[PDB]
Motif scaffolding. Structure first.
Motif, PDB file in Angstrom:
ATOM      1  N   UNK A  36       0.805  -1.004  -0.320  1.00 24.01           N
ATOM      2  CA  UNK A  36       0.351   0.333  -0.251  1.00 24.01           C
ATOM      3  C   UNK A  36       1.363   0.899  -0.045  1.00 24.01           C
ATOM      4  N   UNK A  37       0.621   2.348  -0.622  1.00 24.73           N
ATOM      5  CA  UNK A  37       1.633   3.176  -1.619  1.00 24.73           C
ATOM      6  C   UNK A  37       0.735   4.468  -0.856  1.00 24.73           C
ATOM      7  N   UNK A  38       1.468   5.228   0.285  1.00 29.81           N
ATOM      8  CA  UNK A  38       0.266   7.020   0.688  1.00 29.81           C
ATOM      9  C   UNK A  38       1.273   7.995  -0.536  1.00 29.81           C
ATOM     10  N   UNK A  39       1.249   7.934  -1.134  1.00 27.55           N
ATOM     11  CA  UNK A  39       1.913   9.745  -1.607  1.00 27.55           C
ATOM     12  C   UNK A  39       2.117  10.430  -0.967  1.00 27.55           C
ATOM     13  N   UNK A  40       2.808  12.041  -0.635  1.00 29.53           N
ATOM     14  CA  UNK A  40       3.453  12.645   0.321  1.00 29.53           C
ATOM     15  C   UNK A  40       2.505  12.268   1.841  1.00 29.53           C
ATOM     16  N   UNK A  41       2.315  12.866   2.635  1.00 30.63           N
ATOM     17  CA  UNK A  41       2.883  12.528   3.821  1.00 30.63           C
ATOM     18  C   UNK A  41       1.234  12.050   4.421  1.00 30.63           C
ATOM     19  N   UNK A  42       1.378  11.196   5.283  1.00 30.13           N
ATOM     20  CA  UNK A  42       0.873   9.967   5.889  1.00 30.13           C
ATOM     21  C   UNK A  42      -0.686  10.303   6.544  1.00 30.13           C
ATOM     22  N   UNK A  43       0.090  12.133   6.986  1.00 33.26           N
ATOM     23  CA  UNK A  43      -1.475  12.807   7.710  1.00 33.26           C
ATOM     24  C   UNK A  43      -2.528  12.685   6.888  1.00 33.26           C
ATOM     25  N   UNK A  44      -2.309  13.165   5.518  1.00 35.01           N
ATOM     26  CA  UNK A  44      -3.274  13.221   4.427  1.00 35.01           C
ATOM     27  C   UNK A  44      -2.559  13.425   3.740  1.00 35.01           C
ATOM     28  N   UNK A  45      -2.938  11.976   2.883  1.00 36.04           N
ATOM     29  CA  UNK A  45      -1.863  12.223   1.389  1.00 36.04           C
ATOM     30  C   UNK A  45      -2.297  12.111   0.228  1.00 36.04           C
ATOM     31  N   UNK A  46      -1.697  12.543  -0.624  1.00 31.42           N
ATOM     32  CA  UNK A  46      -2.257  13.151  -1.736  1.00 31.42           C
ATOM     33  C   UNK A  46      -2.818  12.186  -2.815  1.00 31.42           C
ATOM     34  N   UNK A  47      -2.579  10.599  -2.509  1.00 33.20           N
ATOM     35  CA  UNK A  47      -2.822   9.459  -3.390  1.00 33.20           C
ATOM     36  C   UNK A  47      -2.948   8.230  -2.340  1.00 33.20           C
ATOM     37  N   UNK A  48      -3.839   6.911  -3.083  1.00 34.81           N
ATOM     38  CA  UNK A  48      -3.514   6.362  -2.064  1.00 34.81           C
ATOM     39  C   UNK A  48      -4.131   4.850  -2.956  1.00 34.81           C
ATOM     40  N   UNK A  49      -2.510   3.836  -2.892  1.00 36.05           N
ATOM     41  CA  UNK A  49      -3.142   2.996  -4.033  1.00 36.05           C
ATOM     42  C   UNK A  49      -2.436   1.817  -3.474  1.00 36.05           C
ATOM     43  N   UNK A  50      -3.138   0.552  -3.978  1.00 37.70           N
ATOM     44  CA  UNK A  50      -2.678  -0.561  -3.474  1.00 37.70           C
ATOM     45  C   UNK A  50      -1.640  -1.559  -5.011  1.00 37.70           C
ATOM     46  N   UNK A  51      -0.205  -1.699  -4.769  1.00 40.70           N
ATOM     47  CA  UNK A  51       0.221  -2.620  -5.821  1.00 40.70           C
ATOM     48  C   UNK A  51      -0.307  -4.686  -5.533  1.00 40.70           C
ATOM     49  N   UNK A  52      -0.179  -4.868  -6.333  1.00 37.98           N
ATOM     50  CA  UNK A  52      -0.504  -6.087  -6.395  1.00 37.98           C
ATOM     51  C   UNK A  52       0.417  -6.902  -7.722  1.00 37.98           C
ATOM     52  N   UNK A  53       0.573  -8.427  -7.578  1.00 39.73           N
ATOM     53  CA  UNK A  53       0.878  -9.140  -8.858  1.00 39.73           C
ATOM     54  C   UNK A  53      -0.046  -9.780  -9.017  1.00 39.73           C
ATOM     55  N   UNK A  54      -0.057  -9.653 -10.933  1.00 40.78           N
ATOM     56  CA  UNK A  54      -1.108 -10.259 -11.534  1.00 40.78           C
ATOM     57  C   UNK A  54      -1.036 -11.419 -11.808  1.00 40.78           C
ATOM     58  N   UNK A  55      -1.472 -12.748 -12.607  1.00 42.75           N
ATOM     59  CA  UNK A  55      -1.233 -13.943 -13.506  1.00 42.75           C
ATOM     60  C   UNK A  55      -0.179 -13.956 -14.734  1.00 42.75           C
ATOM     61  N   UNK A  56      -0.297 -12.443 -15.323  1.00 38.48           N
ATOM     62  CA  UNK A  56       0.835 -12.439 -15.943  1.00 38.48           C
ATOM     63  C   UNK A  56       1.793 -12.344 -15.176  1.00 38.48           C
ATOM     64  N   UNK A  57       1.962 -11.252 -14.254  1.00 40.78           N
ATOM     65  CA  UNK A  57       3.600 -10.599 -13.676  1.00 40.78           C
ATOM     66  C   UNK A  57       4.194 -12.408 -13.501  1.00 40.78           C
ATOM     67  N   UNK A  58       3.222 -13.416 -12.518  1.00 43.47           N
ATOM     68  CA  UNK A  58       3.893 -15.050 -12.672  1.00 43.47           C
ATOM     69  C   UNK A  58       4.286 -15.773 -13.981  1.00 43.47           C
ATOM     70  N   UNK A  59       3.302 -15.424 -14.481  1.00 47.52           N
ATOM     71  CA  UNK A  59       3.524 -16.546 -16.005  1.00 47.52           C
ATOM     72  C   UNK A  59       5.360 -15.289 -16.710  1.00 47.52           C
ATOM     73  N   UNK A  60       5.547 -14.540 -15.850  1.00 49.59           N
ATOM     74  CA  UNK A  60       7.519 -13.574 -16.619  1.00 49.59           C
ATOM     75  C   UNK A  60       7.818 -14.557 -15.366  1.00 49.59           C
ATOM     76  N   UNK A  61       8.115 -14.166 -14.341  1.00 50.52           N
ATOM     77  CA  UNK A  61       8.980 -15.523 -13.547  1.00 50.52           C
ATOM     78  C   UNK A  61       8.796 -16.525 -13.435  1.00 50.52           C
ATOM     79  N   UNK A  62       8.026 -17.151 -14.576  1.00 47.41           N
ATOM     80  CA  UNK A  62       8.576 -18.626 -14.684  1.00 47.41           C
ATOM     81  C   UNK A  62       8.710 -18.631 -15.631  1.00 47.41           C
ATOM     82  N   UNK A  63       9.135 -17.911 -16.704  1.00 52.37           N
ATOM     83  CA  UNK A  63       9.851 -17.527 -17.888  1.00 52.37           C
ATOM     84  C   UNK A  63       8.752 -19.006 -18.736  1.00 52.37           C
ATOM     85  N   UNK A  64       7.023 -18.657 -18.580  1.00 51.67           N
ATOM     86  CA  UNK A  64       6.051 -19.943 -19.133  1.00 51.67           C
ATOM     87  C   UNK A  64       5.941 -19.110 -19.929  1.00 51.67           C
TER      88      UNK A  64
END
Length: 355
Positions: free
Chosen positions: A327-355
């Protein structure tokens, strides 16, 4: 925040980064140059020569990273030396105390999944230059990290569950042929476990300058405090915790010399340890730690105040090891400029497996 997906050969990866972030990289360079020109006796011609030497080290030692750097340069329509400068700021700007970033970092082992995170603190002008990259390389973990545009390794995590944090450290010494800190960060981000990250950093046979890196997954974590003449490992305390700010906690030899971190480095460390003493373990309470304003403006959640504090917390990242989410908060955590969650999808995993 600009999110760039990079894939293919090292050059193609760099080119995508440079092209998509072209305008941002121009700002990164101008800011870095302003930072240095305001503090040095040397001419631009001399400094360019220093960058040429640093570039030749990367070219010889880490050719895949150099190819990516060349790719960034081509995509951003900049000189290779300018991209080298971005990636070696610590080393290139060695001995300029006004040019320093800060950080507060923590890891907590917990029965429902470990939590790890940091605030990263610097001049507010760099906040608009923060971007994120997803890098896919066949047979390697897919990487998602936050960086100032143009830099190949910073703060983030990978599909193997390895999560990396960075804190400025100020031990004396510069070895121009050693491994640059942001190269070490990329090495760690490309590893399949913290054990492997440690081994691969130690494999380089010595650091170029001083910093601290924390590497963790759900199972194990360590911190590394280093200089060109010392590499010491921080481990979990009796409570299953690690905390780090911007000063040495470990027993380096008396020959090592620490070059004046701010008093607040100690205050923030003591404060975070205190907050963790009363921490109930929940993800919600963990996130709130990063918004602490005790000793404001020099607080864990750092604030700009003209005439007192030049920098501010520019982002916060929290790794939920159990779920492999960041979970990323841009700016100061007291009042973030934005917030989002990074996650790996099945294509990300396919690359890592060389599949």
């Amino acid at each position: 925040m600009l999110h760039i997906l990079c894939q293919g050969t090292p050059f193609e990866i760099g080119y995508e980064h440079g092209s998509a972030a072209k305008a941002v990289i121009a700002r990164s360079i101008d800011f870095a140059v302003d930072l240095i020109r305001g503090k040095t006796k040397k001419t631009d011609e001399e400094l360019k020569q220093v960058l040429s030497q640093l570039g030749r080290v990367i070219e010889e030692r880490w050719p895949k990273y150099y190819e990516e750097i060349r790719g960034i340069a081509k995509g951003a329509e900049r000189d290779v030396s300018e991209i080298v400068m971005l990636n070696t700021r610590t080393e290139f700007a060695y001995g300029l105390k006004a040019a320093r970033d800060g950080a507060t970092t923590a890891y907590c082992q917990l029965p429902n999944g470990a939590l790890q995170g940091q605030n990263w603190d610097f001049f507010s002008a760099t906040k608009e230059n923060l971007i994120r990259l997803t890098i896919r390389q066949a047979g390697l973990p897919t990487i998602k990290f936050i960086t100032e545009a143009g830099i190949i390794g910073k703060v983030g995590f990978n599909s193997a569950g390895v999560a990396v944090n960075y804190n400025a450290l100020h031990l004396q010494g510069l070895r121009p042929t050693g491994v640059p800190s942001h190269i070490a960060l990329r090495i760690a981000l490309e590893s399949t476990s913290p054990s492997q990250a440690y081994d691969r950093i130690v494999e380089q046979g010595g650091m170029a300058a001083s910093a601290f890196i924390m590497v963790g997954n759900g199972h194990e974590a360590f911190g590394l405090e280093f200089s060109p003449t010392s590499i010491r490992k921080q481990v979990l305390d009796a409570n299953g915790r690690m905390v780090h700010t911007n000063h040495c906690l470990l027993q380096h030899g008396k020959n090592e010399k620490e070059l004046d971190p701010l008093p607040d480095s100690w205050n923030r460390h003591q404060r975070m340890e205190f907050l963790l003493d009363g921490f109930d373990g929940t993800k919600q309470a963990f996130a709130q730690l990063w918004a602490d304003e005790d000793n404001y403006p020099f607080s864990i959640c750092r604030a700009y105040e003209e005439g007192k504090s030049r920098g501010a917390t520019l982002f916060n990242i929290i790794y939920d090891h159990a779920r492999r989410e960041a979970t990323v908060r841009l700016g100061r955590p007291t009042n973030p400029d934005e917030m989002f969650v990074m996650r790996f999808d099945e294509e990300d995993e396919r690359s890592a497996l060389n599949a």
